[PDB]
Every structure is written in structure tokens, then in C-alpha cells.
């Protein structure tokens, strides 16, 4: 939540204050789509996206993917070592793995 909030905060901050600010949900959907595409290992290349927006979204995806990998491996270590974990935690961890 903090990383996505920071990315959206920066993008909306440098985005011009006009009526165009109606496009906040569009930016969030773009972020979610890029994250899904990385999760689904599918090529993601928006044609009309500006290169600075694309660069920032790539950096967001890379950072969240690094955290995703580390968290998945740490949770797996917790589970194999015998630590006490939740059922939904096991389900999400199995999906990530």
C-alpha cells in the first residue's frame, strides 16, 4: 500500500492541475495492469504511454516485484521451519510460489 500510494502521489503531483485530474483512476488501473502483466509474465507495452510515465511504472513494478519475491521466500521459510501461519497466508504464498 505504501509503495503504490507513493507512486500514485508522485504521478498525480506532477500531473497538471487541470480538468485532466479526472484520470487518476486511469493511472491506478495502469499500475494494476502493469503489475498483473509482470505477475502473469506477459509482455506489457502500452503504445500511447509517455516514456516518463512508462519509466516510473516500470520502476514501481520492479520494486514491488522485488518485495514480492522476498516476501514470498520469507513466508515459505516461515512455513517450512514450522512457524505459525494462517490459511489465507498459505494460499497466497502458494500462489506466489
Amino acid at each position: 500500500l505504501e509503495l503504490r500510494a507513493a507512486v500514485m502521489h508522485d504521478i498525480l503531483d506532477m500531473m497538471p492541475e487541470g480538468i485532466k485530474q479526472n484520470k487518476a483512476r486511469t493511472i491506478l488501473q495502469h499500475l494494476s495492469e502493469a503489475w498483473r502483466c509482470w505477475k502473469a509474465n506477459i509482455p506489457w507495452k502500452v503504445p500511447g504511454l509517455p516514456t516518463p510515465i512508462e519509466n516510473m511504472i516500470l520502476r514501481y513494478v520492479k520494486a514491488k516485484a522485488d518485495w514480492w519475491t522476498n516476501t514470498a521466500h520469507y513466508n515459505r521459510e516461515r512455513i517450512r521451519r514450522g512457524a505459525t501461519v494462517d490459511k489465507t497466508v498459505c494460499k497466497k504464498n502458494l500462489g506466489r510460489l
Binding site: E2, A5, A6, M8, H9, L12, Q21, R25
Partner: protein, 81 residues
């Protein structure tokens, strides 16, 4: 060039008979689903905030979480330190 409409039996231009057959058999009950879902979305009320509201809420959240935003770090709930 004139042709004869297979459905109405009236002289028709030969250039239009293709889309004439496409559209003269337009299924009558299709009109409501064209004119029903659009009314539903016209009367539908939004679920998420307007974009300016997301912007303002993001500013307010940045005001507090200095562990992420700002340059002068402070407590989680504190405005500035």
C-alpha cells in the same frame, strides 16, 4: 440500378441492398437492451471518489506518513518534526 426488397417488395437502390438486408431485419427486441443498459449506467452512481478527491486524500496521507513522503521524517501520525 433498382432491385426488389425481399422483405417489403419495394424498389430499392442496388447500392444499399446489402446494408438494407443488414438493417431492415434489425431484431426488434435488440432495441431495449441497447436502450436499457445505457439507462442503467446513466442512472448509476459512482463508487470511487472523483480524481481531485484522490489527489486531496493522497496529500493528506502524505502529510502524516513521513516514513515514506516528505524529507523531514517524524512520527507516523505526527504532521511534521
Amino acid at each position: 440500378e433498382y432491385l426488389v426488397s425481399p422483405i417489403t417488395g419495394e424498389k430499392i437502390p442496388a447500392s444499399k441492398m446489402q446494408e438494407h438486408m443488414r438493417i431492415g431485419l434489425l431484431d426488434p427486441r435488440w432495441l431495449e437492451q441497447r436502450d436499457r443498459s445505457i439507462r442503467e449506467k446513466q442512472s448509476d452512481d459512482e463508487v470511487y471518489a472523483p480524481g481531485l478527491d484522490i489527489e486531496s486524500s493522497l496529500k493528506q496521507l502524505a502529510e502524516r506518513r513521513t516514513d515514506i513522503f516528505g524529507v523531514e521524517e517524524t512520527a507516523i501520525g505526527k504532521k511534521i518534526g
